[model samples]
Target chain A: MKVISFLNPKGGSGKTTAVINIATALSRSGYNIAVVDTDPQMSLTNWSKAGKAAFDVFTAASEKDVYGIRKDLADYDFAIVDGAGSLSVITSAAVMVSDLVIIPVTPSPLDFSAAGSVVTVLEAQARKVEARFLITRKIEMATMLNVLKESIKDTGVKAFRTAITQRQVYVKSILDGDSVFESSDGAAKGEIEILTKEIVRIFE
Target chain B: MKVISFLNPKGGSGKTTAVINIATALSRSGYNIAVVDTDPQMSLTNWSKAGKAAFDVFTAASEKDVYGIRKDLADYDFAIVDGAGSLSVITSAAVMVSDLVIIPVTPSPLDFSAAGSVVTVLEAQARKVEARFLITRKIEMATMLNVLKESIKDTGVKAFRTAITQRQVYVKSILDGDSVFESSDGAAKGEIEILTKEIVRIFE
Candidate 1:
C-alpha cells in the first residue's frame, strides 16, 4: 500500500480537515483507505465517530505505533496518517515510514516557519521523501494570501494548484462531523476532487 | 529563578504570544527575566531579535536542552518557556522543571482537550506541578466564548480570571517584532499587566 502523511508540527493548520475530505474522496473513487490518527488531540477520531467516514480509521497512540503504520495497514489501497501537533519524535517517525508527506499551510504568518520544519525533519534524517505543500484555509480577498504563496515558493517546495479556500460550509461540516461532500456546495467538493486527483497522480 | 512554561502539544493555542507579553510586562515590573524558546519554529527567538526585549531569550534546540533550562538561566528572576508545537517530551520536560505551568487557550472548539493534555502529561508522571489556564485570543462577542469558559471550568483546572482579549494590536505587534506595549494599545497592555501580576502572585 502507498502511505501518505499530513505533517506540520503546528496545530490549527487544517491537517485533520484536509485528511478527512481527501480520504473520503479517495474512498468515493472506489479505493480502500485507512486513516491513522497520530494527533494526540484525537480530533479526527472524534469526528470519525459521527460515522460518515467512507474509510477505516485507526489511532496511533505512540511513536512506535506511528512507525508501524505502513506495515500494519499494508492491506489498504492508501494509508493516510493525520500528523501530530507534537512533531518532535512523531514527525521523524511519519517521514521515515511515509511514501509521500503532505505539509498543510494556512494563510496566516504563523505557519511559515512551522511548515518549513517538516522539511527540516526529513532532511535531518537524510531521508528522501516526496514532500509538497497543500495550502489550506486560504482567504481569497486577504492580502496575505500572496505572501503565503510567495513564502512557499521561496522554500522551493511545490504546492498543489488546487488550494482549499476558507468556507463556512467546510467549517460547519467538519464541526457537525460531516465532510464537505455532504453539503450542497459543489465548489468545495470540486476543490477536493481536483486535489485528490493531484495526489493520486503523484503515487502513479 | 522561578520557572514558568506555557505548554500545549497542539499549536495555535497562543503559547508564544502569551509568553511574549507576559514576560515583557514582568520585566517592566523591575524583575530580570529570561525566556526559553522550546518551540522548534523559533518564533519567539525571531521576535526577540528585533531588539525591544526587556528580558533575555534562549532557544532549546532539543529535548535534552529543555531539561536544562532551570540551571541554564539561573541568573534571572524568572525563566518562562514558550512551548513547542510538538509537546511529547517537551511537555514532560517543562512540567518536571517548571515552578508553574500555563496552558494558553483560545475560545474555539479546538483547544479544550489540547489544553487539557498538559494536565494529563503532568499526571502521567505523577508529578505535582502548579498548572493553570490562561485564556488568550478571546472573542467576547462570539457565542462560543461562554462554551469555552465552561469547558475550562469542567476541566477542574483553575483559569486566570482575566483573559487576554483578541485584539488587532496583538497580531500587528507580534508580526512587527514589537510588543503590545509599544503599540499604544492601552487595553492590550493592561491585559498583559494584569496577567503578569496574577502570575507573579502565584510564585510569591
Candidate 2:
C-alpha cells in the first residue's frame, strides 16, 4: 500500500479537506483507501461521523498510535493520513512513514513561511519520501499567488500546478460530510478531479 | 497601557495581518502603539521592515522573551502582540499578558474547533482578560458564516459584530507593507475601521 500524507505546520491549509476529497475520489474509483486522522483535534474523525463516509476512517491521535496503525494499513491500496496544524511528534511520525507527503499551502507569505518549517522538519526526520506542495484556497488575480509560486521556486520546493481556489463547496462538503465529487459546485469538482488525476499519475 | 494579543492555535487565521492592520489603524490615530511579534515566523517583523511602520515593532521570539518585554510595555498606550500558530508556552504567555485577547477564526467548523483548543488554553491560564472571537476571511454569502456565528453563540463565547471579509485588498496591503487604511479599497478599510472602533470602545 502506498501511504500519502497531507502535512503542513500551518493550520487551515486545507489539509483535512484535501485528504477527504482526494480519498473519496480515489475510493469511488474502486481503490481501497484507509484515511488515518492523525490530528489531535479529531477533525477527520468528526467529519466522518457527520458525513457517514463511504470508506473507513481511523484515529491515530498520537505519534505511537500512527506508527502502530500504519503497520496494519499495508493491506489497503492506499493510506491517507490527515495531520494537525502544529509540528508535533505526530507530524514527525507521519512524515517519516509516508510514501508521499502532500503539503497544502495557502497563498500568503505567512502561510508559505509556516509551510517551510514543515519542509525543514521533513528534511530532518524522513528518510526517503516524495514530497511536494499543493496550493489551496488561492484567490485568482491575487498577486501574492504569483509571489508565493516564485517563492516556492526560489526555495527549490517542488509544487503542483493544480491549485485549489477558495470555494464554499469545500467548506460545505466538509460540514455536510460530502465530497466535491458529490457536490453540484462545478469549479470545486473540476479542481478536485485535476488534483486526483495528478496524485494518481505521480503515485503510479 | 492596554495590551491586546491575537492568539489562535490555527495558522492562516489572519492573526498577523489583523494585528498589523489594527495596530496601523490605531497608530494612525495617534495611539502610542507597540507591536510585539511573539511568532517565530516573524511575519509582523517582516511587514514592519517592508512597510516602514509608524509604531515600534519588537520580537519576543520565545515564551520568556514575551513575559519579559510585556513588563516594559507599561509605558506605551497600547501593545499589540501577534502570536504563533500553536498552543506552546509562548501562546500561553501571550494570553496571560494581554488586556484583551482576540481569537481570529475563519467561518468553518474545522477552524472553529481549532480555535476552541486555544479557548481551552485561555480558560486555564489567563485570569480576567477580555477574550472574544473575531471572524476573519469570511465569505459573506456563505451560510456557514451565520452557522459559525450561531455556533459561537451556542458555545457562549463573545464575538465581534464586525467580520473581516475575504478581500484582495488584505493581500495587496500586506504585500505592499500597507494597511487597509493606506489601500484604495473601501470595503477593507471600512471593516478594519469598524473593528478598531469597537476595540477602542471596549478597552478605552
Candidate 3:
C-alpha cells in the first residue's frame, strides 16, 4: 500500500486537517483509505468523531514501530499518516515507517524554512522516501511564496501545486469537524477536489 | 506598561526563539525590558540565563496574575510574557495581565486558525489587549507571504515589519548563550533591527 505522511516538526502545521480532508476526498474517489494518526494531541481522532465519517480511521497510541501500521495498511489501499507535532520518540517511530512524506506549510517564512529540519530527519534516517511540501492557509500568492518554493526547490524537494487559502471557513469546520470542502462558497470545495486529484496522481 | 505575550496552540511556533531575540532587540534600544515566562517549559528562562543580560526574567511556573508582572513592569520599559504552549489557567493569567499580546505564527494554517481561539480566550476574560502576529523562522518572502500579511490584517492586528529567517547561526548563538545580533555573519542581525524598530513604531 502507498503511504503519504503529512509531517512537520512544528505543531499546528495542519497535519490532522491535511490527513482527514485528503483522506475524505480520496474516500470520495472510492478508494479504500486508512487515516493513521500518531500525534498525541489526537487532532485527527477528535475530527473523526466530530465528522463521524464512515471512512476507515485508525489510531496508533504507543510509540510502536512502523509495523504498527500493518493492520490498517493491509486493510486499506492508501495509508495517510498524521505525525506528532514535535520531533520525539514517537515521531521518529512514525517517520521510520512512512514511505512518502507530505509536509504542509503555512505562508510564514519560519514555516517555510522549518521544513529543513523535517527533511533532515528523513535523510538522517536513510529513508528513501519522496518528500513534498504543500502550502496551505495562503491568502494570496506573492514573492514570499516564490522565494519559499525556490528555497525548497534548490534543496531538490518537490512542493505541491495545490494550496489551501487562508479563510475563516476552515476555522468554522474545526469547531466541529466540518472540512473546507463543506463550505458553501464552493471556492475551497473546488480547490480541495483539484488538490486531492493531484495527490493521487503523484502516488501513481 | 505595554505587554506582549507569545502564544501558539502548537509547540515550536518559535515562542522561545522569539522571546529571546525580540527582547534582545528591544533591550538594545536602551529600554529596561522584563521577560515573564509563564511556560513550565522554561526554555525562555534558560535562554535568558544563557544570554546573561541585565534584564529581569521571571518564571510563574503555574502561577498567573498581573502581580507576577506588576513588580517589574513599573521598573521596565517593556514586558514580554511567554506562556506555556497552550491556553491554560496560567495562560489566562498572562493574558489578563498583558496590555499587548504578540502571537507568533508559522505558515501553518492550523496555527493561523488556532490564533482565533487564543483571541477568544483574551476577549472572554474582558482583557482589552491588542494583539499582533509575527512571522518566525521565515526563509524568504513569497506569494504565501502576502497571504499571511492579509490574514494578519484581517485579524485587525499589527504584524512586525521584520521576519526572522531560518539560520543555523541563530540556533547556534542560542546554544552559546548569545544574542543573534552578537552571532556570526549577522544572520539574525537584520531581523533584530527590523523587529526593534517596528516595536517602537507599533507601540507609539
lDDT of all predictions? 0.82, 0.81, 0.69
lDDT per residue as tens, model 3, B6-78: 7665765677777877788888878888888765446667666655754678776566344567665777878
Predicted candidate 3 versus true structure: per-residue lDDT over A126-151, tens digit per residue: 74777788877674546466656678
Order of candidate numbers by lDDT, starting with the best: 1, 2, 3
lDDT, candidate 1, at B103: 89
**Candidate 3 chain B lowest-lDDT run of ten:** B106-115
Looking at model 3 chain A, report the run of 10 residues with the lowest lDDT sum.
A106-115
Show how many residue pairs clash in every candidate, following the order shown: 1, 0, 14
Q: Is candidate 1 or candidate 3 better by DockQ?
A: 1
**Chain A of model 1, TM-score against the native?**
0.95
- Indicate the residue-level lDDT of B193 in model 2: 84
Deviation in Å, model 1, residue A97 alpha carbon: 5.1
Q: What is the C-alpha lDDT profile of model 1 across A93-167, one tens digit per residue?
A: 888889898999977656667887787776865557788999997766455677788888877678999999866
Give me candidate 2's TM-score against the actual structure.
0.95
Error of 1 at B58 (Å): 2.5
Where model 1 places Cα greater than 4 Å from the true spot, the runs are A28-31, A61-77, A87-99, A108-110, A120-129, A139-147, A166-172, A183-190, A200-204, B61-75, B108-110, B121-129, B139-147, B165-168, B184-190, B201-204
The numbered model that scores best in DockQ is 2
B67-154 per-residue lDDT for model 2 (tens digits): 8656688778999889888787877787777888899988886777777766776677535678888889887656788788887876
On lDDT, the candidate that comes out on top is 1
Candidate 1 chain B, which ten residues in sequence have the lowest lDDT sum? B138-147
